[PDB]
Write a protein that binds this DNA or RNA. Structure first.
Ligand SMILES: Nc1ncnc2c1ncn2[C@@H]1O[C@H](CSCC[C@H](N)C(=O)O)[C@@H](O)[C@H]1O
Length: 388
DNA sequence: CCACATGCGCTGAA
DNA sequence: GTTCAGCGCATGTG
């Protein structure tokens, strides 16, 4: 029939917001979504990716595949030979083995080359690390010389350069999608970002940059992210694809209240010691009030009203600990609620929870690293493919 | 200079 | 090596 098979390759895959968004819109597009491959080295993300996206996977105690050597328990550092031994002969090893075998996980982007990068990819995503780009962090940036984690962007450059020479034009990925944080468009980062856009044109791609807020895509979260959607020059001509004006999109509001889960056994914060003020609403529809003498870290010092939207969920720190005011008291958004906040489903969260391998704080960590799924649904909805 | 808005962060002690 | 409570300022707009 006219079912189009869509082969997706996810670099820096995390828990697969990209794959989730494609499977969500697939039926409406008459698409069949297929794993071409992925690159993710973070043990908790990989386990969780498998939990969320597997069909009929049955975990068991297994030896770790002998070439699974570049993986990380914290997402920043490679695991030692000893840490690898500790994963060997466990249920967790089976998740890592399954990711390799069934999802074609290549684990470490540095280990990706023209000899293992799949041909004929329809959608190639690269949500590269934001650490050195985020305004919340130290802003070391992405200068090539510095070899930073956000600088792993230049590994994507390497890969494209390599495959350009060995692949036919038609074997090159059809669509590319970058995601990163808003500070990528800062004055200090523009030089590097512009250098990247010029390389993409060098590689035969036509691109558009979008700065999109999750709050405009049916979410109760202020989260501004930069996307660079690219289309291969010739495929643009063959399809007649045109870039949509996604920055003009505004959907109906959603409030924090709309995703909250009722419980009788929540832990409430004792804030009796701290002076406070009326709630105040900013232009963005964040309704918040400060806690005085709480900490010296600004972003930690706010309680949010559930009748507005909330702040960007971060993996760690202040914005991973989102305090909301409810009738029963002030509490943090829970891991379930953080999954819902990134527009994953309750069933997605239950699958990760049921693995019994991911702590509550690690579940928030991987949610905070992710992308709100309906932003991606909106972007992927604009894509065109040539009829079979 | 100011007031305001906002953050897929970092790390050392236990 | 883990883990997370305690910790600040960058990058804006007006
Ligand atoms: N050398 C490397 N190889 C593969 N993955 C890497 C890497 N360095 C960092 N990463 C991963 O890149 C990710 C950036 S966050 C991306 C999250 C993803 N878009 C999602 O849906 O959740 C992190 O999960 C981090 O573990």
């Amino acid at each position: 029939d006219k079912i189009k098979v869509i082969k997706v390759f996810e670099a820096f895959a995390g828990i697969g917001s990209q794959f989730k968004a494609l499977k969500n819109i697939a039926r409406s597009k008459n698409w069949e979504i297929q794993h071409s491959g992925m690159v993710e080295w973070f043990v908790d993300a990989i386990v969780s990716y498998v939990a969320i996206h597997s069909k009929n996977f049955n975990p068991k105690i297994e030896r770790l595949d002998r070439d699974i050597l570049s993986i990380s328990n914290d997402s920043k550092m490679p695991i030692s030979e000893y840490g690898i031994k500790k994963i060997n002969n466990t249920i967790k090893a089976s998740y890592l083995n399954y990711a390799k075998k069934h999802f074609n996980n290549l684990f470490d982007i540095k280990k990706v080359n023209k000899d293992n990068f799949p041909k004929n990819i329809d959608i190639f995503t690269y949500s590269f690390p934001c650490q050195d780009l985020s305004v919340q962090g130290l802003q070391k940036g992405i200068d090539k010389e510095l070899n930073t984690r956000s600088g792993l962007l230049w590994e994507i450059e390497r890969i494209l350069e390599e495959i350009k020479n060995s692949f036919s034009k038609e074997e090159m990925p059809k669509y590319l999608l970058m995601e990163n944080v808003k500070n990528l468009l800062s004055h200090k980062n523009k030089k590097n970002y512009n250098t990247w856009l010029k390389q993409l044109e060098k590689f035969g791609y036509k691109s558009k940059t979008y700065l999109l807020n999750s709050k405009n895509f049916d979410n109760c979260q202020n989260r501004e992210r930069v996307f660079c959607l690219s289309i291969r020059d010739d495929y643009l001509e063959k399809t007649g694809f045109k870039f949509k004006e996604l920055e003009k999109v505004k959907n109906p509001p959603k409030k924090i209240k709309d995703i909250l889960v009722d419980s009788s056994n929540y832990k409430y914060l004792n804030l009796n010691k701290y002076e406070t003020t009326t709630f105040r609403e900013t232009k963005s529809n964040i309704i918040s009030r400060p806690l005085k003498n709480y900490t010296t870290f600004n972003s930690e010092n706010y309680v949010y009203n559930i009748n507005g939207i909330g702040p960007t969920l971060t993996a760690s720190g202040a914005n991973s600990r989102i305090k909301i005011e409810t009738q029963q008291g002030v509490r943090y958004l829970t891991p379930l609620e953080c999954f819902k906040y990134m527009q994953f489903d309750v069933n997605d969260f239950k699958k990760v929870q049921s693995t019994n391998l991911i702590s509550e704080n690690k579940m928030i960590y991987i949610a905070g690293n992710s992308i709100p799924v309906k932003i991606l649904e909106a972007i992927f909805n604009t894509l065109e493919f040539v009829n079979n």
